[PDB]
């Protein structure tokens, strides 16, 4: 049941069917390239893409660095028939990896039946294909055949790791936003991937490896296939819809470019950045686009440029857009059918959900930026497999995502040089004469994401008219593996559209790519004058350059920032004195033991508080580590948190702007009792919604403006902890190298073993820090944000009570005999509050999942788990050690364990 049923080799000769030299649409003349049809409607061209866009045809690095965090340039890459053969095989393998998942199997099928609409006709009685949605397949006899296609995978342009969907346009039409769709060209490579940092999984995986992890390329391709899917169905969000950020403040990013489309594609929390009002706007926008396509089809009385029948064609599009067809043959769009389909394309196909299916380590948000680039080879099975990716079953690589740990799995990952320079794009932060200015550069992607307030729009202040008829929007349930299973089991895998004979296009197909909006390169090296040391300074002070000299820890941030041999520590002065002391060889091991103990002790410290509600634990050293808030003793931090709440953690206090809510106006029905009572019930139903809307809104403003600040603080604490380990190691390693060959020979000292120990201590520390910071973020929601919403809601309930009573009394004639019972319904309903339940609006907060993580944590620490299963005694751990059973071993028949 494979997706690609031929196994191609790049040197296979052209057959004119699935292997040919082909012409894609182009502005001017384009040189034919060798392509492979790996599936119906899907082609692969193993070539660096200089053809798609003749404008940028040169594979060299640009004059000015791109403003991304990671980029790589090699002009020679993919110039060889061998590399071409490997590209083809890698891409194919990734298609197969995706297809082998329930989610991927749907996506791939959706893409195939996602045939670009025939909108070519300027006469609406006729149905015609659009030219730029086709290619010309050159035959062995020199003739070309015109053939329509959905998807082409091509090699990357000058920037090897920049992957994107490209497609051709129309003189007037926007094919990606009008529901028509257009053939999608994806720049991709399976021969490289990104490195990233992950501290979150330590909760369930306390043994998580150190250093960078590699993105599973299958996730990356899937990401682009999702874009492709939107673009084919003409539902992509306009590229001028972007999430604006505040760049003016010293702590804010100089600039960041991210689009609603990308947010939609990532899924998870990123997609919850887009508020309900706008998510609605889109759904309606494309629904009407779909409705338009229905009316275009309905008035088409004949087909042109094919031997296929109008019947067959109209049916192709009925199956693509899920159209309802009455007894006459007229098409319309069922809001129910459409909602289901648009939901699958935008909420089911998401990077987040693919990760759930692949079971790989992946960035939880786009705000966890790629820190590195890596050369890989996934073609050999000993490296990467369709089922397991890099994390190979029944081996060390299967545990704790080791397959993706670049250091543990180092043979599969070769570190390349990031073309994006050191401090290429930064801000310059300077403290004032605390003796003259001490300035440091801060990497743009080390700064704070602070979304612009004009990102969150709401109709909350708009009133409504309640009506006997007015009816209720549904619950709008969250996406879950079982809902996906619902779509899956109802999905139709049978009917792929045929590859039809179409009238031959001209030898060259004329067209240009859709224009992308020009984005202002954001400012560089903005300078800032500050009165107080910042978080960025405190963290920078924890760094050192390698060298032969002995570094010392200091408790003075000032000293540390001023001298290359001085590294700041948030550990106690006792630790400082001890790690710095010149240590005799005979005492070296015991010294190290003590240092490892002290390290683990200080980083494991947790103060419990019984005083406050939502925050049970506090990690006190966060204060001196990041200079959170101010003053001196860590007892000040514990104290300030207990007193002021979570707000002391925030870099900026977010605006939460919740207006006076729009009141209800009820339409009166004279003498009609049943209508008058329904209107009353509807106003109460819509009131329950007003509460849910206000809660969704706040949750949305919190994910974007607050939980992102806390996620940064968290990432920085891991950076702090790693720096402390590096420093301590460097000092220990210096001490060892001071010894004589003879002294060393009597000290068995393994720096890799010591490193491994400190990395475990850092993990334990991150577990606590993670819990503390989660409680902190949530506490701020419960206590500092939600209440503004609840006040606006209670004022709304009060107004509605007065209105509803007035409506009842004015209508006492119609309502006679029922007046008392209705008063009670109104007074009782509106005197209650609807409690905010966080578990309702976001995935990670259910109570059970806390116990779930605890069970995982113990199971993932089991390196041998020996059970009797089926007929054999085996190892149920991910290492799957072999078991040899003697002939005289006896197993209890009643319980064979």
């Amino acid at each position, epitope marked *: 049941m494979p997706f690609v049923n031929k196994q191609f080799n790049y040197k296979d000769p052209v057959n004119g069917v699935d292997i040919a030299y082909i012409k894609i649409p182009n502005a001017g003349q384009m040189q034919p390239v060798k392509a492979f049809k790996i599936h119906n409607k899907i082609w692969v061209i193993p070539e660096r893409d200089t053809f798609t866009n003749p404008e940028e045809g040169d594979l060299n690095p640009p004059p000015e660095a791109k403003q991304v965090p990671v980029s790589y340039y090699d002009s020679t890459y993919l110039s060889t028939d061998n590399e071409k053969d490997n590209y083809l095989k890698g891409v194919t393998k990734l298609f197969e990896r995706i297809y082998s998942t329930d989610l991927g199997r749907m996506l791939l099928t959706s893409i195939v039946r996602g045939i670009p609409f025939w909108g070519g006709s300027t006469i609406d009685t006729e149905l015609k294909v659009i030219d730029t949605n086709c290619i010309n397949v050159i035959q062995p006899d020199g*003739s070309y055949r015109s053939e329509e296609l959905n998807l082409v995978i091509i090699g990357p342009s000058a920037d090897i790791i920049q992957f994107e969907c490209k497609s051709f346009g129309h003189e007037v039409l926007n094919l990606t936003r009008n529901g028509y769709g257009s053939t999608q060209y994806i720049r991709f490579s399976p021969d490289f991937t990104f490195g990233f940092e992950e501290s979150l999984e330590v909760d369930t995986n306390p043994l998580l490896g150190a250093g960078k992890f590699a993105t599973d390329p299958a996730v990356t391709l899937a990401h682009q296939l999702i874009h492709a899917g939107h673009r084919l169905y003409g539902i992509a969000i306009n590229p001028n819809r972007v999430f604006k950020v505040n760049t003016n403040a010293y702590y804010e990013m100089s600039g960041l470019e991210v689009s609603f489309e990308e947010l939609r594609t990532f899924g998870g929390h990123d997609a919850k950045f887009i508020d309900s009002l706008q998510e609605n706007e889109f759904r309606l926008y494309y629904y009407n686009k779909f409705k338009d396509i229905a009316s275009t089809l309905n008035k088409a009385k004949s087909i042109v440029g094919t031997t296929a029948s109008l019947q067959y064609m109209k049916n192709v599009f009925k199956e693509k857009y899920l159209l309802s067809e009455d007894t006459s043959g007229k098409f319309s769009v069922d809001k129910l059918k459409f909602d289901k389909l648009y939901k699958m394309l935008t909420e089911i196909y998401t990077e987040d959900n693919f990760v759930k299916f692949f079971k790989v380590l992946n960035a939880k948000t786009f705000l966890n930026f790629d820190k590195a680039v890596f050369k890989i080879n996934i073609v050999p099975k000993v490296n990467y497999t369709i089922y397991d990716g890099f994390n190979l079953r029944n081996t060390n690589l299967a545990a704790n995502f080791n397959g993706q740990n670049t250091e543990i799995n180092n043979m599969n990952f070769t570190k390349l040089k990031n073309f994006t320079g050191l401090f290429e794009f930064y801000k310059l932060l300077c403290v004032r004469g605390i003796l003259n200015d001490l300035c440091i550069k801060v990497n743009n992607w080390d700064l704070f994401f602070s979304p612009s307030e004009d990102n969150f729009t709401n109709d909350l202040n708009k009133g409504e008219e309640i009506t006997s008829d007015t009816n209720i929007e549904a619950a709008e349930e969250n996406i879950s593996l079982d809902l996906i299973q619902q779509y899956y089991l109802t999905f139709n895998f049978d009917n792929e559209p045929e590859n039809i004979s179409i009238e031959n296009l001209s030898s060259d197909i004329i067209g240009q790519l859709e224009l992308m909006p020009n984005i202002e390169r954001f400012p560089n090296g903005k300078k800032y004058e500050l009165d107080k040391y910042t978080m960025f300074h405190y963290l920078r002070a924890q760094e050192f350059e390698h060298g032969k000299s002995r570094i010392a820890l200091t408790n003075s941030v000032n000293e540390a920032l001023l001298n290359p041999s001085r590294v700041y520590t948030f550990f106690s002065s006792d630790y400082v004195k001890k790690v710095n002391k010149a240590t005799e060889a005979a005492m070296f091991l015991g010294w190290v033991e003590q240092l490892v103990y002290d390290f683990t002790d200080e980083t494991s410290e947790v103060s419990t508080t019984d005083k406050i509600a939502d925050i049970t634990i506090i990690i006190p050293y966060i204060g001196p580590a990041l200079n959170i808030g101010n003053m001196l003793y860590k007892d000040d931090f514990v104290g300030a948190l207990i007193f002021s709440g979570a707000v002391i953690l925030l870099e900026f206090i977010p605006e939460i702007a919740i207006p006076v809510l729009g009141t209800f106006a009820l339409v009166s029905y004279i003498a009609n009792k049943v209508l008058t009572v329904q209107t009353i019930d509807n106003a109460l139903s819509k009131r329950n919604e007003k509460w849910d809307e206000v809660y969704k809104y706040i949750v949305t403003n919190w994910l974007a403006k607050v939980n992102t600040q806390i996620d940064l603080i968290r990432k920085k604490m891991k950076e702090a902890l790693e720096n402390q380990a590096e420093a301590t190691k460097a000092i220990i390693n210096y001490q060892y190298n001071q010894y004589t060959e003879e002294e060393k020979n009597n000290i068995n000292f393994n720096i890799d073993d010591l490193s491994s120990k400190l990395n475990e201590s850092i993990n334990k520390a991150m577990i606590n820090i993670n819990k503390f910071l989660n409680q902190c973020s949530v506490s701020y929601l419960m206590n500092s944000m939600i209440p503004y919403g609840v006040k606006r809601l209670e004022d709304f309930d009060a107004s509605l009570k007065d209105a509803l009573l007035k409506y009842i009394y004015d209508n006492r004639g119609t309502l006679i005999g029922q007046v008392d019972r209705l008063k009670d319904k109104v007074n009782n309903t509106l005197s209650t509050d609807i409690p905010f339940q966080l578990s309702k609006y976001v995935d990670n907060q259910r109570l059970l999942s806390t116990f779930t993580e605890y069970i995982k944590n113990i199971i993932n620490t089991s390196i041998l788990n020996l059970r009797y299963e089926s007929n054999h005694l085996i190892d149920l751990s991910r290492y799957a050690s072999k078991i040899n059973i003697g002939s005289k071993v006896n197993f209890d028949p009643i319980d064979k364990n």
Partner: nanobody
Amino acid sequence: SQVQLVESGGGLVQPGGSLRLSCAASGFTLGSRYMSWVRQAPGEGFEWVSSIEPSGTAWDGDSAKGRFTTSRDDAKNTLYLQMSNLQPEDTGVYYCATGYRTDTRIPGGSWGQGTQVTV
């Protein structure tokens, strides 16, 4: 009738000034197809020489770029190849072939009988 391809050129000059090869086609309109030039040296495989599009555009391989210019005359239905600055490593039999970048004998393709070149 059928598809016929016939090359014409003598192929003798010592290194090395110039030569104009010719291919007369019948059965089809020359300008409606992708055509190629390819040579086979004594005791050796095929090498892609040139290619010409219906659009009249001409692409040339590593061999003889900045040397040969591929051309056509539609009324005379004949494919021309203009060679210059020839060397001894250019020796072999020159076939006018049916595809784009035709490197090989492909079922369905048409060829000439070959034209000798000794330099």
